[PDB]
């Protein structure tokens, strides 16, 4: 019954955002709540933020 078929492949990029789930290898898991500016972050005595 079918005469022909056409198939299309899309590609998408996904950047991380509030709501995405994250985890480590020790059972600690959680959701991202905020992306906050570079100069609001705690920093050490040498200027390097976390």
């Amino acid at each position: 019954g079918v005469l022909k078929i056409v198939k299309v492949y899309l590609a998408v990029k996904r950047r991380i955002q509030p709501g995405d789930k994250m985890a480590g290898r020790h059972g600690n898991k959680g959701v991202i709540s905020k992306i906050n500016p570079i100069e609001d972050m705690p920093y050490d005595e040498n200027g390097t933020p976390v």
Binding site: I38, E39, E45, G47
Partner: protein
């Protein structure tokens, strides 16, 4: 009773990317009030130049390969968005690159221009592993401040652009590390004055003194909503 005022005593250049400045004399409790304001300004608002679009010929999207070149095209775009360039008189410029042979393709192979300069001429762009291989591209560079991802300005203007112009994300800010210190100043009459030392790490493409002038200017212009109220 009136306050003393700080002055831009000395600037020491430890490297082409790292420097130290000193402001003195300051009253008691003004090393922190100025230190943190200037660190918060210098880290978010300085202007600079960045790569915004690429065209390679015989290339339709960034998920392809090219014969004779051993990087995918995504890796070439990622190597290009880390290119530090300084532009003298315009707010936009277009460069070209043409290379042929075997070996690495670096930033010293972009064609010479009058009022554009490249602070790191050994930044690696790609490799050519074939003798009959050649690459040719034309790169668009712009000026701005902040961080603008490509998925935001592709919504700025909506008209048709040809298939084959690949968008890159723009990180415009040239300052990457700021630290500061408050030490005891040495003035012969009083001992309740301090000096403020600022350590700066950049990618080239900006002067430390001019950067401090821009930061102080932005702060002084923002205070005018209070200095004259209603």
């Amino acid at each position: 009773t009136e306050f003393l005022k700080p002055r831009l005593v000395d600037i020491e250049q430890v490297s082409s990317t790292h420097a130290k400045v000193t402001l003195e004399p300051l009253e008691r409790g003004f090393g922190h009030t100025l230190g943190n304001a200037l660190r918060r300004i210098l880290l978010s608002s300085m202007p600079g130049c960045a790569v915004t679009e690429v065209e390679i010929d015989g290339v339709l999207h960034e998920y392809s390969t090219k014969e004779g070149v051993q990087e995918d095209i995504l890796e070439i775009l990622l190597n290009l968005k880390g290119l530090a360039v300084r532009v003298q008189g315009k707010d936009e410029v277009i460069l070209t690159l043409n290379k042929s042979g075997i070996g690495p393709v670096t930033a010293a192979d972009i064609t010479h221009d009058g009022d554009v300069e490249i602070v790191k001429p050994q930044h690696v762009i790609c490799h050519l592993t074939d003798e009959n291989a050649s690459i040719s591209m034309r790169i668009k560079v712009q000026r701005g401040r902040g961080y603008v991802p490509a998925s935001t300005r592709i919504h700025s203007e909506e008209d048709e652009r040809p298939i084959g112009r690949l968008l890159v994300d723009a990180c415009y800010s040239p300052v990457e590390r700021i630290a500061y210190n408050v030490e005891a100043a040495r003035v012969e009459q009083r001992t309740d004055l301090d000096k403020l030392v600022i350590e700066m790490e950049t990618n080239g493409t900006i002067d430390p003194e001019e950067a401090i002038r821009r930061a102080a200017t932005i702060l002084a212009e923002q205070l005018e909503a209070f200095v004259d109220l209603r």
